Ligand binder design. Structure first.
Ligand SMILES: CCC1=C(C)/C(=C/C2=NC(=C\c3[nH]c(/C=C4\NC(=O)[C@H](C)[C@H]4CC)c(C)c3CCC(=O)O)/C(CCC(=O)O)=C2C)NC1=O
Ligand SMILES: CCC1=C(C)/C(=C/C2=NC(=C\c3[nH]c(/C=C4\NC(=O)[C@H](C)[C@H]4CC)c(C)c3CCC(=O)O)/C(CCC(=O)O)=C2C)NC1=O
Ligand SMILES: CCC1=C(C)/C(=C/C2=NC(=C\c3[nH]c(/C=C4\NC(=O)[C@H](C)[C@H]4CC)c(C)c3CCC(=O)O)/C(CCC(=O)O)=C2C)NC1=O
Ligand SMILES: CCC1=C(C)/C(=C/C2=NC(=C\c3[nH]c(/C=C4\NC(=O)[C@H](C)[C@H]4CC)c(C)c3CCC(=O)O)/C(CCC(=O)O)=C2C)NC1=O
Ligand SMILES: CCC1=C(C)/C(=C/C2=NC(=C\c3[nH]c(/C=C4\NC(=O)[C@H](C)[C@H]4CC)c(C)c3CCC(=O)O)/C(CCC(=O)O)=C2C)NC1=O
Ligand SMILES: CCC1=C(C)/C(=C/C2=NC(=C\c3[nH]c(/C=C4\NC(=O)[C@H](C)[C@H]4CC)c(C)c3CCC(=O)O)/C(CCC(=O)O)=C2C)NC1=O
Ligand SMILES: CCC1=C(C)/C(=C/C2=NC(=C\c3[nH]c(/C=C4\NC(=O)[C@H](C)[C@H]4CC)c(C)c3CCC(=O)O)/C(CCC(=O)O)=C2C)NC1=O
Ligand SMILES: CCC1=C(C)/C(=C/C2=NC(=C\c3[nH]c(/C=C4\NC(=O)[C@H](C)[C@H]4CC)c(C)c3CCC(=O)O)/C(CCC(=O)O)=C2C)NC1=O
Ligand SMILES: CCC1=C(C)/C(=C/C2=NC(=C\c3[nH]c(/C=C4\NC(=O)[C@H](C)[C@H]4CC)c(C)c3CCC(=O)O)/C(CCC(=O)O)=C2C)NC1=O
Ligand SMILES: CCC1=C(C)/C(=C/C2=NC(=C\c3[nH]c(/C=C4\NC(=O)[C@H](C)[C@H]4CC)c(C)c3CCC(=O)O)/C(CCC(=O)O)=C2C)NC1=O
Lengths: 225, 172, 162, 60, 162, 163, 172, 162, 162, 172
């Protein structure tokens, strides 16, 4: 949300900016999942370095690659794929059931690449990331078109800094917002276990009243006077 | 995604051993009946609109409450969603039939489908009935003798029924 | 893994469509090639121990310095690990032959090969020599299309290691 | 076929950025976009909605 | 234009890798299945005139109302357009047979099908009945695997219409 | 969800993250003024629904006399009775669209998924186009003035969706 | 992510107070010994491949079940992920040794790590063992008196040990 | 906060690499400049009462029109809040000096500064005048590098106000 | 290239802000550290030839099989290439010392290093041992803080290789 | 980007030989006046709003055709763009001052700023005059000896004026 800077890469750039930008791109678009050296796309980043494609075109190529499909598409329900795609390509969570219906129909009709295009050719992607900056999780700060459920739902989709969106869990790759979006509910705000040691002396509920052990009763003038 | 071959390989790798001769002969069988499997898959693919149409007609003759106002297949949006789901389930059944393994259906189509349908408000019993009707319609085309050399395909019929039954049981 | 049937179903699935004639034609070619492929897998599984021992010996002939004291091939545990590794490569080549694809190799050897070899300072050239010996010997065995099927996967491994 | 679009960002786009703001870093006005045929219509209509004025569209 | 070879090349190019065992076996299956599809292409190209005229007559029989005036079938120009359209369908089905892929149909008929049928009010059941006629004819003009090839491509075109 | 004037007003102001300015109040005001023609039109179409539905069924039969032949869709008593049901659906969704002063109900209930259901059940859009043209003709008799214009705007939106 | 200075500042802010004299003195002490801290960070950074190599060798010598077919580090993929994990934990321990506060570990390195390991089925005991082995291997390079001025750097050794222990305890 | 150590570590982490020479030299510079910075913080903390009361008085002199009834400065509560605000600014300046980075100033004063001032109609020129007075008094309380450090952070706050 | 000043300026430009306390403190650390770094660069430029000769001979003692006919180190041309490569590394170490940043080593050696060595079968351990020898004589040649600077840059190179 | 040290390294690498003693001496002198360079950069930074305001006031008093309706800086948005352009040019100039190399200013900005100003319709001599007024305003602050020890920085003034006039001539 705050500490990591927004990685931007214009067409003229030096070596360290390029290498760091690719590190950030792979650490975001591919979940937090490890991408082995046999999976790194060399032609795609040659095209990025030359300036044939922007960062947005590179993101499109990466989301259409089989690293992305194998992790987030081929072992998933479409609900999970849509959740992940929103998180990883728009930086937010699905707001409505209408988005899931729209994207499911779009994939069923026109196939996977048109779906990735709708994610990356959207006016919201261009508003927040344009062509130069890597996507980032953006619903942890209030932006103009946010909705009340976005914070909770993204926080539900975000598993911490050391978590990842891996298909290699023993439970597999499962949708976690498939029920909350249909009911139009918020998301779960239960954070990892490593964090119950942070700022334990804060007292947000300071105004809360402790109840008495027994309620005050009036035997004569009635009981609630 | 797994087929019979990759499934046998993964099982063998789990114990860190080569593929036994028994496994190789089973896979050689599967390969030899591969052509019958291909004809089964083609029958499912090519007759899909007819399968789904017959299934829809039967289902919405039995269950009027779906297509009434307040039913879950009432407006064109919901009815289109119904037919779309039926075609997607049939598609994944055919994928699994070609694969010889049911893992694609479980991983993709049925992963959390019951929770999805419960969330949306869909009668999962009606979805299971639609899948059973699709199975009944599909067996008719799977057994079509025309346009193919005569032979034995009883195992393939049992396998297709197995994948349809898996889908129906997982949904409801 | 990524075997012919799996790319077939995967492309159909990603495009949101049924399997068409092209997909079934690829599957049919797969089912034809299953015969020499599983024959080659049978032959390699049968002759695994001799192939492994010969490959280890070829490695030690090509890189004699490895067995000197203080070098990676010194001792019995190191050379037993050598034999285990060559058996691994042979196992996964037979798996790839059976499954008609490089999915088993890609998924259990090539994914992570360079990082692991670099961390433990394992020279890929040793495995190149071992796989070259396995190639030469599977030439003697495996007449016909079985030979070509075997060499395709042996070459995939060798090309990965380089 | 691939189509290269040289778009010049002009006052129509500058007004939109003056109203909405810069949620993305400011950039030079003249840049070239490369599109496939499948994408040419959506990208070009999008550039129109953004108020950008195309200069030359070359095929390749 | 999606074919077996085209998908072979597209996958390996997207991954940025050389063509390997998997898609080589896929291309092999395509090459083996070429000859029955090729001679089925021979068969449909030879008998094109009879098939087109018969399909036109089958359409005008299944939909008698189109013939009478005030409908789409009235007129020699509309009639020639019917024959031309069925000939287009047959030509592209033969293209799919020779190409071992659905690509010709997808590119030349299926893409933009529903939009222009809605715009020019061309009922898809007309061409569906014509294609069912041609299906009946290729049932007898062809035998063996070529019959299956022609039937798969024709009924793929039908499904695209339906 | 539905695209009423008010809803798009609010959605536009919300996407820009601003309050409702004078322009949007102008739009709302105009909608509130067109409410009276729309509501009287919906009342007139609702009173006269039975003749509309029966006449639409008859017109579809007349324009396509072959659908009542055996082996066709119109054959059977159930098919025709629930054809009357479909026409009633279209009619009351048109009334909904009139009342809402926006095509939202049509786009949401009939138009979304119209083509796919028509295909899967092999139903000619021309049948319903003929029925909606019959209603378009008869509303001129039922209605007069601006309410007539509103009704025909929504009926023709339905037709163009089918067209 | 805090350093020692920002931690002191946050406490002072909560009190609403300027930093007391004794707080400024403890901070001036921390910065006055900052050179030894930089040397210790350089020792950790420069020898990191050696530390990870030695820890890995010892860990897989102790626990052969990790590298047997079916173990959690069996194929190349899992072994590469394991080595990356050791790399990452050493990286963050060096970050914490530079800052002087273990907030970087719990904020970033150990944020959701235990849940990750549970969902993947990784034996957390073996991970904590790997961290202890890295701690032992790192202490050798931290005490290395070559190329640096002789001095008392026991506080640094204890602090680094506590960072390693905090990791291995948060995973386990 | 965005102190030298923290930004170093954050940029190192965002690139997935250890701390190299550049970062260690930056940290060394920070640990060396600690001495003048801690000295400036001591000087300002010892003299916080005189500094803040003088700043409030300077504001009331350069903005005479504020003290009269009917506007912001009239009343004991409003002047108490004035002194409290300048105490806040000076506190966070000493925090910045101790931390050797504008992180405390940024996080605690600059983020949300303009919106808060606009909401409560607090003129930034008031705090600019107070900080200018504090700059003048630190010119006398501090010498050498301590003065440069204190003035640097005070000017950062002023530029943020204007 | 990655210097202290360039990291300063890029971090300031990326956030669209001016240079400030943290960034000027980093630059001040650079300017303070310049003296040992320029001194080490001077001392290493004096003794380039002896260092390179010793490093080449060190590799040849450590990997004696390399000098064997049929291997990489056999032949005067290959040994001239070895000396040229060690000279390359030493020159870029001196550049990095002057720049107070690993930017020169990164850009001119490390970027592309693994793929190039893989393609030409250049064992990184050769260069690691040569850099170890250079590290050894840096202790004799340099003392003070120039010693530490040279050693940390050499260790950066060795970490990149290993 | 590129620095003076980086520039010298690049030139040495083009001829592929070690930095000469003269180059090392010049770079040592640069590092010796680095403290003065830091003061000059801090002077530019700490008064940047004052520099912008003075330059803008003098420019708009000089040229009222920009203020008046129909001018190139008439509405609020065009005024704000004017001020933002002055600010960014100043920021790049200070970057060049700190690095000692004009690359940080020449690379990203000045190459495309020509086409941008030509397309937008801005009077280019007006912008060059704005940058010159910025230089004139900034020299006073660079000279201000208050709060800094008295010394000579003629090289710094020459270099800063060089960067200012270079940017102004580039946009011109
Ligand atoms: C914030 C810093 C950060 C950390 C710490 C981190 C840890 C991390 N380790 C992972 C996997 C793993 N981690 C291990 C390591 C364990 N298994 C072995 O037995 C050892 C005993 C032990 C290591 C010493 C293994 C084997 C995997 C792969 C699990 C699998 O492939 O099934 C994954 C899953 C990524 C993926 O596979 O796509 C993460 C996110 N990630 C981060 O971004
Ligand atoms: C690719 C794997 C996959 C599938 C197949 C899947 C199914 C699925 N079905 C959905 C809705 C639906 N599904 C159905 C179908 C059912 N309702 C009727 O009663 C029938 C009995 C029955 C079909 C035979 C209907 C009507 C909806 C819309 C319900 C609603 O809008 O609330 C939706 C939500 C999108 C929408 O609202 O249209 C999904 C995601 N999800 C997946 O990730
Ligand atoms: C579109 C509907 C919508 C709303 C309304 C919304 C509110 C919202 N308030 C937030 C933080 C906050 N909100 C408050 C407000 C509280 N402080 C006091 O106690 C008051 C009692 C109370 C306000 C009257 C504060 C202080 C924070 C900052 C807490 C923090 O960031 O740690 C955040 C976290 C992101 C951020 O810091 O900007 C959100 C998302 N989000 C939405 O999507
Ligand atoms: C382009 C895609 C493609 C298809 C469609 C295809 C079909 C195909 N079907 C075949 C035969 C066959 N097909 C069947 C299946 C039939 N047996 C029963 O009648 C069932 C009703 C029915 C199953 C649906 C059988 C039994 C054979 C003979 C194989 C044998 O007896 O071993 C053969 C072997 C040669 C022949 O006998 O003609 C092929 C290649 N090949 C392809 O590359
Ligand atoms: C959103 C509002 C809505 C509409 C508009 C609607 C129409 C509609 N008509 C249908 C069936 C049908 N529709 C017809 C067509 C009619 N039958 C003949 O009397 C006429 C000639 C002809 C109309 C002019 C027929 C014959 C069927 C049943 C057989 C079939 O289509 O396969 C179906 C499929 C399920 C069912 O049997 O009810 C729908 C969804 N349903 C809705 O919920
Ligand atoms: C399933 C895929 C897979 C492969 C391929 C694999 C290879 C592999 N071999 C290893 C050890 C080893 N492997 C060798 C092989 C050498 N021995 C010498 O005699 C020969 C010159 C040479 C072989 C030709 C050696 C020496 C070691 C010990 C390295 C060490 O202890 O650092 C290790 C390090 C961990 C261990 O097992 O102790 C791996 C990961 N591991 C896998 O999970
Ligand atoms: C480029 C980055 C950089 C580094 C790495 C760096 C290290 C550094 N080490 C130093 C000496 C030292 N280094 C150490 C640390 C060592 N003492 C040994 O016994 C222990 C094994 C070990 C840790 C306890 C000690 C104790 C001193 C001398 C005491 C002191 O300088 O305060 C000094 C002070 C110089 C002196 O007074 O002689 C520095 C600046 N400086 C830098 O600019
Ligand atoms: C078309 C949109 C537009 C507006 C609204 C606008 C206002 C405006 N007035 C200005 C000057 C000024 N404006 C004032 C206004 C003050 N004079 C006092 O009698 C009052 C208390 C108070 C007015 C209520 C003053 C004192 C100045 C001179 C100081 C300065 O801003 O440079 C300036 C600075 C540059 C200039 O001279 O134009 C602007 C931008 N300019 C525009 O292009
Ligand atoms: C790499 C750094 C960088 C620079 C330098 C840059 C300059 C720049 N100036 C612009 C417009 C402008 N620039 C100016 C400034 C000039 N016009 C005159 O009035 C003034 C005397 C003079 C200021 C000294 C003005 C007034 C506009 C508005 C033109 C318009 O809106 O039509 C624009 C168009 C974008 C927009 O208006 O929102 C750019 C891109 N952009 C960058 O990314
Ligand atoms: C926190 C950020 C930071 C700053 C701001 C900084 C400035 C700085 N200025 C200094 C003195 C100086 N400053 C200047 C520059 C001034 N002399 C003339 O009056 C010019 C008008 C003017 C230049 C614009 C000079 C010439 C010296 C003395 C350097 C010398 O000749 O020895 C010194 C050395 C003081 C000493 O050790 O005796 C420093 C460190 N250093 C930092 O780490």
């Amino acid at each position: 949300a705050t500490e990591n800077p927004k990685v931007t890469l214009r067409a003229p750039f030096t070596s360290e900016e390029f290498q760091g930008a690719l590190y950030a791109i792979y650490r975001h678009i591919f979940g937090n999942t490890y991408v082995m050296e046999s999976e790194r796309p060399t032609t795609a980043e040659s095209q990025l370095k030359d300036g044939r494609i922007t960062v947005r075109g590179f993101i499109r190529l990466l989301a259409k690659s089989e690293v992305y499909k194998s992790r987030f598409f081929q072992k998933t329900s479409q609900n999970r794929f849509i959740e992940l795609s929103h998180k990883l390509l728009l930086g937010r969570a699905p707001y409505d059931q209408a988005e899931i219906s729209y994207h499911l129909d779009l994939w069923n009709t026109q196939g996977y690449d048109a779906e990735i295009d709708s994610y990356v050719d959207s006016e919201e992607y261009l508003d927040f990331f344009g062509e130069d900056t890597v996507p980032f999780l953006r619903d942890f700060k209030y932006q103009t078109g946010q909705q009340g459920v976005g914070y909770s739902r993204l926080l539900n989709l975000y598993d911490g800094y050391a978590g990842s969106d891996t298909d290699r869990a023993q439970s597999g790759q499962k949708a976690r917002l498939n029920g909350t979006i249909a009911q139009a509910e918020p998301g779960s705000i239960e954070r990892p276990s490593a964090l119950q040691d942070t700022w334990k002396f804060a007292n947000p509920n300071y105004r809360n009243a402790k109840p008495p052990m027994v309620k005050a009763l009036a035997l004569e003038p009635v009981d609630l006077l | 995604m797994n087929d019979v071959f990759t499934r046998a390989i993964a099982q063998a790798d789990l114990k860190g051993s080569f593929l036994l001769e028994s496994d190789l002969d089973k896979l050689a069988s599967f390969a030899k009946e591969g052509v019958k499997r291909l004809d089964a898959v083609a029958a499912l693919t090519n007759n899909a609109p007819a399968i789904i149409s017959d299934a829809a007609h039967k289902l919405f003759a039995e269950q009027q409450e779906l297509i009434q106002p307040g039913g879950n297949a009432y407006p064109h949006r919901r009815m289109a969603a119904c037919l779309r789901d039926m075609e997607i389930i049939l598609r994944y059944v055919s994928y699994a039939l070609l694969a010889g393994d049911a893992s694609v259906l479980d991983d993709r189509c049925l992963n959390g489908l019951r929770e999805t349908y419960n969330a949306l408000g869909t009668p999962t019993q009606s979805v299971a009935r639609a899948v059973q009707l699709m199975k009944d319609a599909a067996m008719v085309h799977l057994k079509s003798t025309a346009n193919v050399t005569v032979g034995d395909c009883s195992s393939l019929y049992s396998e297709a029924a197995t994948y349809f039954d898996k889908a129906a049981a997982s949904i409801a | 893994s990524r075997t012919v049937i799996t790319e077939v179903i995967a492309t159909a699935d990603s495009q949101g469509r049924f399997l068409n004639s092209t997909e079934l034609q690829a599957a049919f070619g797969r089912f034809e090639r299953a015969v020499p492929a599983i024959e080659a897998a049978r032959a390699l599984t049968k002759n695994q121990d001799a192939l492994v021992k010969g490959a280890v010996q070829a490695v030690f002939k090509k890189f004699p310095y490895v067995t000197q004291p203080g070098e990676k091939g010194y001792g019995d545990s190191n050379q037993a690990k050598c034999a285990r590794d060559i058996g691994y490569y042979l196992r996964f080549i037979t798996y790839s032959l059976v499954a008609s694809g490089t999915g088993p190799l890609d998924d259990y050897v090539i994914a992570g090969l360079r990082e692991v070899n670099r961390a433990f300072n394992l020279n890929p050239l040793w495995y190149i020599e071992a796989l070259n010996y396995i190639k030469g010997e599977t030439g003697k065995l495996l007449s016909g299309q079985s030979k070509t099927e075997a060499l395709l996967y042996i070459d995939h491994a060798i090309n990965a290691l380089s | 076929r691939i189509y290269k679009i040289t778009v010049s960002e002009a006052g129509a786009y500058a007004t939109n950025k003056h109203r909405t703001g810069y949620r993305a870093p400011i950039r030079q006005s003249n840049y070239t976009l490369t599109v496939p045929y499948d994408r040419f219509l959506p990208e070009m209509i999008r550039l129109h909605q953004s108020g950008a004025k195309i200069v030359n569209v070359t095929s390749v």
